[PDB]
PDB file of C-alpha atoms in Angstrom:
ATOM      1  CA  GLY A   1      42.788  28.653-109.583  1.00 34.91           C
ATOM      2  CA  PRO A   2      42.760  27.030-113.043  1.00 35.60           C
ATOM      3  CA  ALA A   3      46.022  26.844-114.983  1.00 38.08           C
ATOM      4  CA  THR A   4      46.551  28.540-118.334  1.00 36.23           C
ATOM      5  CA  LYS A   5      47.817  26.369-121.179  1.00 33.43           C
ATOM      6  CA  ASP A   6      48.483  26.433-124.907  1.00 33.25           C
ATOM      7  CA  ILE A   7      45.682  24.826-126.890  1.00 33.26           C
ATOM      8  CA  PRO A   8      47.281  21.860-128.683  1.00 35.08           C
ATOM      9  CA  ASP A   9      46.744  21.308-132.409  1.00 34.29           C
ATOM     10  CA  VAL A  10      44.087  18.649-132.971  1.00 35.94           C
ATOM     11  CA  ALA A  11      43.492  19.118-136.701  1.00 30.49           C
ATOM     12  CA  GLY A  12      42.434  15.915-138.438  1.00 29.03           C
ATOM     13  CA  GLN A  13      41.476  14.211-135.187  1.00 28.30           C
ATOM     14  CA  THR A  14      37.917  12.991-134.709  1.00 25.94           C
ATOM     15  CA  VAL A  15      35.878  14.873-132.111  1.00 23.94           C
ATOM     16  CA  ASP A  16      36.142  11.824-129.841  1.00 22.30           C
ATOM     17  CA  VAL A  17      39.939  11.662-130.099  1.00 23.69           C
ATOM     18  CA  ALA A  18      40.397  15.444-130.004  1.00 25.95           C
ATOM     19  CA  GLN A  19      38.381  15.851-126.798  1.00 24.83           C
ATOM     20  CA  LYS A  20      40.206  12.959-125.126  1.00 24.92           C
ATOM     21  CA  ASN A  21      43.598  14.481-125.912  1.00 25.42           C
ATOM     22  CA  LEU A  22      42.376  17.905-124.792  1.00 21.70           C
ATOM     23  CA  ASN A  23      41.107  16.314-121.568  1.00 22.69           C
ATOM     24  CA  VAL A  24      44.591  14.990-120.806  1.00 25.67           C
ATOM     25  CA  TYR A  25      45.929  18.544-121.146  1.00 23.74           C
ATOM     26  CA  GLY A  26      43.410  19.616-118.506  1.00 21.65           C
ATOM     27  CA  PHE A  27      40.847  21.255-120.780  1.00 22.02           C
ATOM     28  CA  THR A  28      37.345  20.372-119.625  1.00 24.46           C
ATOM     29  CA  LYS A  29      34.677  22.392-121.451  1.00 22.30           C
ATOM     30  CA  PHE A  30      33.975  22.302-125.176  1.00 20.41           C
ATOM     31  CA  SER A  31      31.522  23.549-127.770  1.00 20.46           C
ATOM     32  CA  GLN A  32      31.185  22.413-131.384  1.00 21.62           C
ATOM     33  CA  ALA A  33      30.536  24.100-134.717  1.00 18.65           C
ATOM     34  CA  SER A  34      29.839  22.302-137.992  1.00 18.93           C
ATOM     35  CA  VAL A  35      31.965  23.517-140.908  1.00 17.33           C
ATOM     36  CA  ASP A  36      32.317  22.872-144.642  1.00 15.94           C
ATOM     37  CA  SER A  37      35.343  20.654-145.263  1.00 16.86           C
ATOM     38  CA  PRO A  38      36.680  17.810-147.454  1.00 16.30           C
ATOM     39  CA  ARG A  39      38.058  16.126-144.323  1.00 14.96           C
ATOM     40  CA  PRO A  40      36.185  12.963-143.260  1.00 13.82           C
ATOM     41  CA  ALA A  41      33.065  13.976-141.315  1.00 13.67           C
ATOM     42  CA  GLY A  42      33.647  14.288-137.582  1.00 12.20           C
ATOM     43  CA  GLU A  43      37.266  15.384-137.944  1.00 13.40           C
ATOM     44  CA  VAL A  44      38.290  18.660-136.318  1.00 11.78           C
ATOM     45  CA  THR A  45      39.497  21.316-138.772  1.00 12.44           C
ATOM     46  CA  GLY A  46      40.710  23.648-136.028  1.00 16.12           C
ATOM     47  CA  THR A  47      39.618  25.431-132.857  1.00 15.72           C
ATOM     48  CA  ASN A  48      38.365  28.773-131.560  1.00 16.70           C
ATOM     49  CA  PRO A  49      40.620  30.119-130.111  1.00 16.84           C
ATOM     50  CA  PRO A  50      43.209  28.640-132.536  1.00 17.86           C
ATOM     51  CA  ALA A  51      45.941  26.142-131.682  1.00 16.76           C
ATOM     52  CA  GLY A  52      48.771  27.840-129.811  1.00 19.04           C
ATOM     53  CA  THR A  53      46.479  30.237-127.966  1.00 18.06           C
ATOM     54  CA  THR A  54      47.113  30.334-124.222  1.00 14.65           C
ATOM     55  CA  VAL A  55      43.786  30.025-122.394  1.00 17.49           C
ATOM     56  CA  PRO A  56      42.421  28.969-118.991  1.00 17.56           C
ATOM     57  CA  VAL A  57      41.913  25.190-118.927  1.00 14.36           C
ATOM     58  CA  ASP A  58      38.361  25.869-117.737  1.00 13.50           C
ATOM     59  CA  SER A  59      37.536  28.147-120.655  1.00 12.03           C
ATOM     60  CA  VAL A  60      35.399  26.997-123.571  1.00 12.51           C
ATOM     61  CA  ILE A  61      37.182  25.591-126.610  1.00 14.49           C
ATOM     62  CA  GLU A  62      35.072  25.495-129.763  1.00 13.43           C
ATOM     63  CA  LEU A  63      35.718  22.497-131.999  1.00 13.70           C
ATOM     64  CA  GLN A  64      35.327  23.202-135.710  1.00  9.34           C
ATOM     65  CA  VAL A  65      33.911  19.927-137.013  1.00 12.60           C
ATOM     66  CA  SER A  66      33.994  18.801-140.651  1.00 13.83           C
ATOM     67  CA  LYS A  67      30.684  17.936-142.315  1.00 14.89           C
ATOM     68  CA  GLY A  68      32.586  15.801-144.799  1.00 16.20           C
ATOM     69  CA  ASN A  69      30.490  17.590-147.411  1.00 19.03           C
ATOM     70  CA  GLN A  70      33.324  18.701-149.680  1.00 19.33           C
ATOM     71  CA  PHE A  71      35.517  17.070-152.292  1.00 18.92           C
ATOM     72  CA  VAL A  72      39.030  18.151-153.222  1.00 18.71           C
ATOM     73  CA  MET A  73      39.012  19.964-156.572  1.00 17.73           C
ATOM     74  CA  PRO A  74      41.021  17.985-159.149  1.00 15.73           C
ATOM     75  CA  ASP A  75      43.242  19.559-161.793  1.00 17.39           C
ATOM     76  CA  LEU A  76      41.134  19.385-164.955  1.00 14.67           C
ATOM     77  CA  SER A  77      43.721  21.038-167.224  1.00 13.69           C
ATOM     78  CA  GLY A  78      43.835  19.556-170.720  1.00 12.71           C
ATOM     79  CA  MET A  79      40.656  17.516-170.309  1.00 12.31           C
ATOM     80  CA  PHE A  80      37.724  17.563-172.698  1.00 12.08           C
ATOM     81  CA  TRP A  81      34.385  18.180-170.975  1.00 12.67           C
ATOM     82  CA  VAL A  82      33.156  14.709-171.950  1.00 15.48           C
ATOM     83  CA  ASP A  83      35.774  13.243-169.593  1.00 14.78           C
ATOM     84  CA  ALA A  84      36.050  16.024-167.008  1.00 15.35           C
ATOM     85  CA  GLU A  85      32.344  15.873-166.152  1.00 15.73           C
ATOM     86  CA  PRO A  86      32.117  12.221-165.052  1.00 14.07           C
ATOM     87  CA  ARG A  87      35.482  12.557-163.293  1.00 13.84           C
ATOM     88  CA  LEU A  88      33.963  15.316-161.162  1.00 14.98           C
ATOM     89  CA  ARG A  89      30.706  13.401-160.656  1.00 16.03           C
ATOM     90  CA  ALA A  90      32.695  10.437-159.332  1.00 17.67           C
ATOM     91  CA  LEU A  91      33.988  12.728-156.578  1.00 16.83           C
ATOM     92  CA  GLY A  92      30.428  13.363-155.425  1.00 15.16           C
ATOM     93  CA  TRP A  93      29.975  16.608-157.337  1.00 13.92           C
ATOM     94  CA  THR A  94      26.243  17.099-157.860  1.00 12.90           C
ATOM     95  CA  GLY A  95      26.667  20.714-158.876  1.00 12.69           C
ATOM     96  CA  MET A  96      26.442  22.557-162.180  1.00  9.61           C
ATOM     97  CA  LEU A  97      28.883  23.725-164.839  1.00  7.35           C
ATOM     98  CA  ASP A  98      29.198  27.428-165.542  1.00  9.36           C
ATOM     99  CA  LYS A  99      31.135  27.571-168.807  1.00 11.05           C
ATOM    100  CA  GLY A 100      32.962  30.853-169.340  1.00  7.51           C
ATOM    101  CA  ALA A 101      34.176  32.367-172.602  1.00  5.76           C
ATOM    102  CA  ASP A 102      36.771  30.536-174.690  1.00  4.01           C
ATOM    103  CA  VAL A 103      40.387  31.622-174.260  1.00  2.00           C
ATOM    104  CA  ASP A 104      43.281  31.767-176.727  1.00  2.00           C
ATOM    105  CA  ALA A 105      45.517  28.991-175.398  1.00  2.00           C
ATOM    106  CA  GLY A 106      46.780  27.736-178.754  1.00  2.00           C
ATOM    107  CA  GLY A 107      45.388  25.193-181.201  1.00  2.00           C
ATOM    108  CA  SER A 108      46.440  22.228-179.072  1.00  2.00           C
ATOM    109  CA  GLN A 109      44.052  23.346-176.317  1.00  2.00           C
ATOM    110  CA  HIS A 110      40.976  23.439-178.576  1.00  2.00           C
ATOM    111  CA  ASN A 111      37.897  22.411-176.544  1.00  2.00           C
ATOM    112  CA  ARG A 112      40.149  21.508-173.609  1.00  2.00           C
ATOM    113  CA  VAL A 113      40.003  22.911-170.071  1.00  2.00           C
ATOM    114  CA  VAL A 114      42.421  25.827-169.725  1.00  2.00           C
ATOM    115  CA  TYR A 115      41.223  27.764-166.684  1.00  2.00           C
ATOM    116  CA  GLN A 116      39.182  26.525-163.727  1.00  2.00           C
ATOM    117  CA  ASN A 117      37.415  27.810-160.627  1.00  2.00           C
ATOM    118  CA  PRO A 118      37.819  26.875-157.874  1.00  2.00           C
ATOM    119  CA  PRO A 119      41.571  26.138-158.234  1.00  2.00           C
ATOM    120  CA  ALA A 120      42.857  22.577-157.877  1.00  2.00           C
ATOM    121  CA  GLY A 121      43.336  21.444-154.282  1.00  2.00           C
ATOM    122  CA  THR A 122      40.462  23.570-152.993  1.00  2.00           C
ATOM    123  CA  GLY A 123      37.585  22.126-150.974  1.00  2.00           C
ATOM    124  CA  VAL A 124      34.364  22.276-152.969  1.00  2.00           C
ATOM    125  CA  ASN A 125      30.819  21.744-151.691  1.00  2.00           C
ATOM    126  CA  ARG A 126      29.094  18.860-153.494  1.00  2.00           C
ATOM    127  CA  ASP A 127      26.449  21.163-154.980  1.00  2.00           C
ATOM    128  CA  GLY A 128      29.044  23.854-155.642  1.00  2.00           C
ATOM    129  CA  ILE A 129      29.330  25.608-158.993  1.00  2.00           C
ATOM    130  CA  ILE A 130      32.414  24.895-161.092  1.00  2.00           C
ATOM    131  CA  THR A 131      33.580  27.475-163.621  1.00  2.00           C
ATOM    132  CA  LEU A 132      35.523  26.155-166.603  1.00  2.00           C
ATOM    133  CA  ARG A 133      36.935  27.981-169.612  1.00  2.00           C
ATOM    134  CA  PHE A 134      38.000  25.964-172.649  1.00  2.00           C
ATOM    135  CA  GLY A 135      40.508  26.780-175.374  1.00  2.00           C
ATOM    136  CA  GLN A 136      39.052  28.340-178.513  1.00  2.00           C
TER     137      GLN A 136
END
């Protein structure tokens, strides 16, 4: 019957490209799930089962597909809010600021971003909430 093969990694590939490459491996049936991701919309973020999993070539592979609805969280350390806000907006952030309590980071950090959530490098939904805490 059908062979069993390792699912190849197709992360970053468009659904069109991913399916074509998977077809060449002998995989024939697919399903698709939309996921939150900063990757360009239509790009595959991964599969279910994951890459490396040995499965029948005639078993369903679910393609996790990026909505392209996230931006990558910048490092806002040391910025005043007057500059950090439009910087975030320029990334497509339509969300809202939740300002936490001031922290003791020294006089040089007065009214400057000290702590942030989510951390830099994290994928953030466009309407996501950003938590910032400024120096006292």
